[PDB]
From a paper:
In order to obtain a detailed view of the structural consequences of BAF phosphorylation, we crystallized pBAF and solved its 3D structure at a resolution of 3.2 Å. While NMR revealed large chemical shift changes between BAF and pBAF, we did not observe any major structural changes due to phosphorylation in the crystal. Only helix 1 is significantly shortened in pBAF compared to BAF: it comprises residues 4–12 in BAF and is restricted to residues 7–11 in pBAF. And only residues Thr3, Ser4 and Gln5 have a Cα atom displaced by more than 2 Å after fitting the two structures. However, comparison of the dynamics of BAF and pBAF in solution by NMR revealed that the motions observed in BAF are strongly reduced in pBAF. As pThr3 and pSer4 are close to positively charged residues in helix α6 (Lys72, Arg75), electrostatic interactions between the phosphorylated side chains and helix α6 could explain the strong decrease in pBAF flexibility. We showed that the crystal structures of BAF and di-phosphorylated (pBAF) are similar. However, in solution, BAF exhibits large motions on both fast (picosecond to nanosecond) and slow (microsecond to milliesecond) timescales, which are not observed in pBAF. Thus, phosphorylation of Ser4 and Thr3 drastically reduces the conformational mobility of BAF. Consistently, phosphorylation causes a 5000-fold loss of affinity for dsDNA.
Numbering used by the authors: 3 to 88
Write the structure that this text describes.
Amino acid sequence: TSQKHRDFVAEPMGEKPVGSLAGIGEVLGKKLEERGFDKAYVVLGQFLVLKKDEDLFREWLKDTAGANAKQSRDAFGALREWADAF
Ligand SMILES: [Cs+]
Ligand SMILES: [Cs+]
C-alpha cells in the first residue's frame, strides 16, 4: 500500500527524506536526489517557491523527477494537505 498520506501529516517534516512524501517512489527519489531535492523539506520549499500552484509543481516534478500523473498528484496533495495543517 502507498497510504503514506496519513504518516506524513500526523507529525512535522523536519529532516524527513524525500521518499517519505506520498507519491515519491524509490526510483523517483534518485532522479530527485541528484537535483538537490534529497529531503521532503526541499520539495515543500519548491512548492512554496511556486506559490502552491497545482499544475506548476506537477509540471516541474515531471520536468525534473520524471514523475507520472499519480506520483505528481499524490505528492502535491500531501504538500497541500501539510501546508493546510502547519
Ligand atoms: Cs536544488
Ligand atoms: Cs492550521
